[PDB]
Amino acid sequence: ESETLNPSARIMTFYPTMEEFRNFSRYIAYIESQGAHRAGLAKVVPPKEWKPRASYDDIDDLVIPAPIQQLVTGQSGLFTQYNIQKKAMTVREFRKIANSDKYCTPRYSEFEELERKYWKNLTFNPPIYGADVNGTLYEKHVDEWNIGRLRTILDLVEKESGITIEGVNTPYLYFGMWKTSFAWHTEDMDLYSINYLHFGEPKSWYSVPPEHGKRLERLAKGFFPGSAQSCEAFLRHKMTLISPLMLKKYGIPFDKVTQEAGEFMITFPYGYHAGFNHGFNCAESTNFATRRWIEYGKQAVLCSCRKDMVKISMDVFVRKFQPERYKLWKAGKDNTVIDHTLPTPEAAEFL
Ligand SMILES: COc1cccc(CC(=O)Nc2ccc(O)c(-c3cc(C(=O)O)ccn3)c2)c1
Ligand SMILES: [Mn+2]
Ligand SMILES: [Zn+2]
Incomplete structure (x- = not known):
């Protein structure tokens, strides 16, 4: 039934009408x-009828409080990226640097050409990334797909605890330049992600199907045994x-896609993704949830070596949406296995 839907687990593209686009949570279920x-x-x-800002x-005078210089080390397809925190900067300053001859996009024809130049020049001339800036660039009056208030059940965190988690239930802006990267990761608590590219050069993405996620981790643990321990x-x-x-060499299935200005990317629970920016650009993102996430949230393996890391209490979710499993869960007897192929329950009206 669900194992027959998208059996190649390839990245799909959607072009909703305006009526379809009015309701966010339903379109996700769709x-x-x-x-x-x-x-x-x-x-x-x-x-084409749509825009989040006039x-x-x-x-240009918006402040990037904490710009990051990305220093990459490694060879032949395997790299570790270190962060060097630079002093605060404005968008106009950032634009100048990004567009300057030292840091700007090299000339190219096909995307494949830029892909090769990225994986060969990744460790040279470390770029600056204006990442994790608190804020939104939506006009306050836009009610469709507003990254600052998507009204999903993730709102239950703030609603019943008052806790705001920056970038997770509030928006982040990212100012990229050529060769700035985001490493392989799933979202915090294995939530969904939504990313909107407001303007500028494209952003390319790699992804691994959630059903093969463990294979990517097995590979990573093998290449970085020290880190893994x-x-x-x-x-x-x-x-x-x-x-x-x-x-490819180790048989992990993946897919790749290029996001252009004015387009959204959605990531799904336990979906590993990575990528890099093509040039100066600006993206907005935040996390969200569906009922299907709840089980991912209950089983997410968190970072165990830093105290700073993001942890959301699952208790309120399991009481409200899985009440009959609550005693089992709280007692450590909930042996539920996750089927990555089943759609969220809210999809019932479409099947
Ligand atoms: C010691 O290393 C760090 C510690 C804290 C924060 C960060 C920044 C980060 O990568 N934040 C982050 C966390 C989750 C994400 O989903 C994305 C992200 C970033 C992009 C992007 O750069 O556009 C695309 C997709 N995801 C980015 C790094
Ligand atoms: Mn992400
Ligand atoms: Zn850790």
Whole structure:
């Protein structure tokens, strides 16, 4: 029934109308009814009728409080990325640097060409990434797909505890330049992710199907035995880069997609993704949830070596949506196995 939907677990692209696009949670259930989640990542092109801001020509004095210089070390498809924190910076300053001859995009024809230059020049001339900036670039009046208030059940965290977790139930802005990267990771508590590329050069993405996630971890634990012994989930450190050739060489299935300005990317629970920016650009993102996430949340393996890391209490979710399992769960007897192929319950109206 569900194992027949998207059996190649390939990344799918959707073009909703305006009526379809009005309701966020339902559209997510819809693309899951089509098996999009099996790829771990999906692209949703919004209608030409739509825009979250009239103009971005007024944002150059916005502060990037904590820019990050990305220093990559390693060879032949395997890399560790170190962060060097630089002093605060404005968007206009960031733009100048990004566009300067030292840091700007090299010339290319096909995307494959830029892909090769990225994996060969990754460890040279470390770029600066304006990541994890608190804020949104949506006008306050836009009610469709507003990253600051998506109204999913993730709201239960704030609603019943008051806790805000920056970037997780609040938006982050990312200012990229050529060769800035995000390492292999799943989301905090294995939540969903949504990413909107407001403007600029493209952002390319790699993804591994959730049903093969463990194979990627097995491979990673084998290449970084030291890290694996020191932490139960070292990939959440967001430092590990692994080229597609390396994945191919060891038979991890993956897919890749390029996100262009004005497009959304959705990641799904336990979907490993990575990628890099093509040039100066600006993206907004946050996490969200569906009822299907709850079981992922109950089973997520967290970082065990840093106290700073993100942990959401699952208790309120299991009481409200799985009350008959609560005593079993709280007593450590909930042996439920996850089927990565089943769509979230909210998809019932489409099947
Ligand atoms: C010691 O290493 C770190 C510690 C704390 C925070 C970070 C920053 C980070 O990668 N944050 C983050 C956390 C979760 C994510 O989903 C993304 C992310 C980033 C992008 C992107 O760069 O556009 C795309 C997809 N995901 C980024 C690194
Ligand atoms: Mn992510
Ligand atoms: Zn750790």
